[PDB]
From a paper:
Ferritin ubiquitously occurs in animals, plants and bacteria, and plays a significant role in iron storage and detoxification. It is a nearly spherical 24-subunits-protein with exterior diameter about 12 nm and a hollow cavity of 8 nm. Like human H-chain ferritin, the ferroxidase centers of HuFtMt are composed of A and B iron binding sites of conserved amino acid ligands His65, Glu27, Glu107, Glu61 and Glu62. Herein, we take the compartmentalization concept to re-design the intrasubunit interface of ferritin to create a new compartment for fabrication of fluorescent Au NCs, while keeping the inherent protein cavity functional.
To determine whether wild-type (wt) HuFtMt are able to bind to Au ions, we solved the crystal structure of wt HuFtMt at a resolution of 3.0 Å upon protein treatment with gold ions. The refined structure revealed two Au ions binding sites where Cys102 and Cys130 are involved in this protein as shown in Fig. 2A1 and B1, demonstrating that Au ions exhibits the high binding selectivity for cysteine residues. The mixture of wt HuFtMt with HAuCl4 exhibited a red color, with extremely weak fluorescence under UV-light as confirmed by its fluorescence spectrum. This is most likely derived from the formation of larger-sized Au particles in the presence of wt HuFtMt. Indeed, the UV–vis spectrum of the mixture of wt HuFtMt with Au ions exhibits a peak at ~ 520 nm, which is characteristic of the larger-sized Au particles rather than NCs. Three Au ions-coordinated Cys130 residues are located at the ferritin threefold channel (a relatively unconstrained microenvironment), facilitating the excessive growth of Au NCs, thereby losing luminescent property. Three Cys130 are involved in coordination with the three Au ions, respectively, which are highlighted in red.
Residue numbers in the entry:
A (entry chain A), B (entry chain A), C (entry chain A), D (entry chain A), E (entry chain A), F (entry chain A): 6 to 176
Amino acid sequence: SRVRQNFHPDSEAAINRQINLELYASYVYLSMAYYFSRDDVALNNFSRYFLHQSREETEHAEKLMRLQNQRGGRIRLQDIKKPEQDDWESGLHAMECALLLEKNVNQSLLELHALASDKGDPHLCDFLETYYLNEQVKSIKELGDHVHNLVKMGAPDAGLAEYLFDTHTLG
Amino acid sequence: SRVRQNFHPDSEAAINRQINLELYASYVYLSMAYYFSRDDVALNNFSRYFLHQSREETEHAEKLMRLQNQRGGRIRLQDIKKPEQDDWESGLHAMECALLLEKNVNQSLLELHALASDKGDPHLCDFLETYYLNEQVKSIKELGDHVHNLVKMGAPDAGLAEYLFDTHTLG
Amino acid sequence: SRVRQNFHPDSEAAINRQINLELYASYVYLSMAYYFSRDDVALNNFSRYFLHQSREETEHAEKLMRLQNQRGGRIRLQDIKKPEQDDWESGLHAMECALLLEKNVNQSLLELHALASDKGDPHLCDFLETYYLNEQVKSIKELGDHVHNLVKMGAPDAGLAEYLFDTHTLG
Amino acid sequence: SRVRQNFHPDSEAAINRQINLELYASYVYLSMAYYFSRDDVALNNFSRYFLHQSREETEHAEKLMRLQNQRGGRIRLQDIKKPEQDDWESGLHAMECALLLEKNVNQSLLELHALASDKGDPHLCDFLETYYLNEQVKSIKELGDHVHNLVKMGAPDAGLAEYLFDTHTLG
Amino acid sequence: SRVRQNFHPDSEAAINRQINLELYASYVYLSMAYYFSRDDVALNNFSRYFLHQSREETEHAEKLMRLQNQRGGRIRLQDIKKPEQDDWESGLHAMECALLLEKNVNQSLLELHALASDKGDPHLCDFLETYYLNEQVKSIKELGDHVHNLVKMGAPDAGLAEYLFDTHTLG
Amino acid sequence: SRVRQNFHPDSEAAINRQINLELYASYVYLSMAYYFSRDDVALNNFSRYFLHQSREETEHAEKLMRLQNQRGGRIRLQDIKKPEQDDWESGLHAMECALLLEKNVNQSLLELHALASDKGDPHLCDFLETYYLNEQVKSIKELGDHVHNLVKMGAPDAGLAEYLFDTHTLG
Ligand SMILES: [Au+]
Ligand SMILES: [Au+]
Ligand SMILES: [Au+]
Ligand SMILES: [Au+]
Ligand SMILES: [Au+]
Ligand SMILES: [Au+]
Ligand SMILES: [Au+]
Ligand SMILES: [Au+]
Ligand SMILES: [Au+]
Ligand SMILES: [Au+]
Ligand SMILES: [Au+]
Ligand SMILES: [Au+]
Ligand SMILES: [Mg+2]
Ligand SMILES: [Mg+2]
Ligand SMILES: [Mg+2]
Ligand SMILES: [Mg+2]
Ligand SMILES: [Mg+2]
Ligand SMILES: [Mg+2]
């Protein structure tokens, strides 16, 4: 390749893997998004909240796909695995799963950054530090906030709790 | 379910399958989209054209997911299969694959409409007739147009052809 | 904690210490700010200059407090020590003390960054690199500039010098 | 001093003390402010409410610092003591501590006014009467209101109570 | 020096060298810029494209000169070497030389970043990561794109190719 | 060449030389520009004044490069020599060097005009008369003015002088 400079094949692989992980999380949030528009769940702000997260994660993937073409790498796509559940059980459960999901995305991204360090790709280091490492910290903190309020409010057994969180926090 | 009326389990299954098919085509077009921003391909309008198609197909899926929740069905998601290639070979080849893809989407949708007919779901009939059956005819005709010009122009061997089509038709 | 990931207790402590250091510098600049509105000093631009620095440093502290809550840490506040003097002696002396102060803030921040490196917190690395390491370089260079002109002009013995610097540079 | 007229050294000392007290309350409210942005508390309006109080109290200090320079006195700053807690326990507890804090600020200010009376400083009397004595009465009444509603609503055991007060009163 | 902190003489030298390298590339692009306004070449968009690159590289140098004065270093300037050719041969050849040039600039900058790492200058690390390491990746990818299209189009023997690239891509 | 008419090879050479001279003066002024943003010099208007002169001289070069391509000549570039000093000593010294520099540029340009006269290039005569001969007279007179005031004010020993000239003339 005529553009490739200082781009280690293992970083290339790392990125391709990370692209799949970001697509997977977009799918998980799309699943949740339409879980909440169910007639027997019907929390439309939860539904809009997770649909926005989903499209946000698709943007994450595209940046990485864009990073692979910028550096000289070759995007190699894999199947996008279906989420662990179609029935996300409750607004609380969906927030806890979202929280657990993003800490794993964070892990993988922390692992990616580390590979880039051992390979002397400062550009890739700066890439993850700039667009991912802090997006994740805010996502994880925000999700943490949401998890905490819904527990303190009494979700999901308190019939009022998820309905109020929907209308007042996510509105 | 308290919303379900005149909604046959086989239509439900049909829809869930169709949702996966629409996600698959969105993925195929995303793959092509980033194929053309490669430094050794670098047809940015082809890349923008297929990225728009991709997001358009994601919208297709969401409507169907929305249709499933409206009728009383239960969205059951499957893995999203990786496309047949990561190297779409040329602007012409990518248009021919896109054309072949959409005729299959069309087939499945024609098959879905037929199931809905034999099951007496006029609502589902009208759904596909309204948002899908003609979107497909226009997609297939448009793709057909593109395929024809690029052949007539001499793609991909004519070095000028794909570059001009990029700048003048897809610009 | 449910948000904490890859956040070493020594980094937590480092941050809590740094928060106090940033509050301390805000206090030092508040002291200077009101030193210059004295009727027997009466350099109102010096006074406005240092009052702006003070509020700027309070902002520094808040970001760090915000960083501690984002990562899962626990803000643990300490007394805010009074400055070394209430009588900052002259506009020159106050600039030299400000310069010496910020090089220490810089030291501590350089030390903090180093801890984060040895602990594999790339997020915290990027945090300090983004909002602190360069703010400090500009502060130190700006203060350096000010120190130099006031010396070259003859502060504080030249009765004209501090009065002109006040009206022409800090105006 | 050439500006000093009718300004008793004990009033000067009183003011310097009061300046420290006003800085202390600003710090207490800053602590609370970031207590509520904790991921395991996450009441963002409580957090904004107390952060505004904090900056309001910093303004209190500055006026007094400004009063000292106007009259001929000499600002003599002391350490700013850390608050009694870093864990403000609940929105209710934080309001009760805020209420108790401001009644003490009020006490000290009432004591200051009294000193000024026995010393024949009508200017200082008018100063406190104009910018402090009523600011305090409104703060104390407002805090009283807040305390009462949160008790009546069932804070902190009622999971709904603090969450609703956050969104509906402090929003 | 009174501003210098944590600034290693070898980093200083590195920067001074890098400043010359950035001036050299500005000169190379100025040469190309006026190569294309030749009456026997006359590709005015190529000429405008390279003249913009040139001024962009002068900006690169100035930032580094600004970085040297900010940190306490001393700008030490060297001769600016004439480019390797005055006759850049063709639009394709000029793009290939530009591509090769920027990968070297990139190399030097990657080497500079590495020096800064071994010297514990995180500020200088962040400087290059922020304003240079990615500017280079985009330049190299963009130049790569251009190189590829002009080859695929048949430059320079195809009389149409450079003329169309001029009017349609660089217009 | 098909555009060349009445264009003597010695004029061509003259122009190529003059182009280098104009690049040299641009470099000298860039050096001065960043000399004054030094933390131990810190005359920001001097710095802006000389940075504007530098870009102005780059424009001079480009016109001559443009003149060479217009007439049929061939731009042949040489190394751009580093200036005589990196330490311009004082605002006065920098103005005196600038003054001496421009009288030499003027000399060379007067010499160029003379060559054009003996060669019967009235176009080149008119070129220099129109864009250079008077730009130089104004530059030299302006620089002369500046030199005179700074001497009369007492530069560089008078600590006030350069600082006031910076803020009041060059502001
Ligand atoms: Au789970
Ligand atoms: Au790295
Ligand atoms: Au195919
Ligand atoms: Au039907
Ligand atoms: Au000192
Ligand atoms: Au790190
Ligand atoms: Au209490
Ligand atoms: Au009184
Ligand atoms: Au070459
Ligand atoms: Au570093
Ligand atoms: Au000289
Ligand atoms: Au002539
Ligand atoms: Mg993500
Ligand atoms: Mg479709
Ligand atoms: Mg600070
Ligand atoms: Mg108060
Ligand atoms: Mg550059
Ligand atoms: Mg000139």
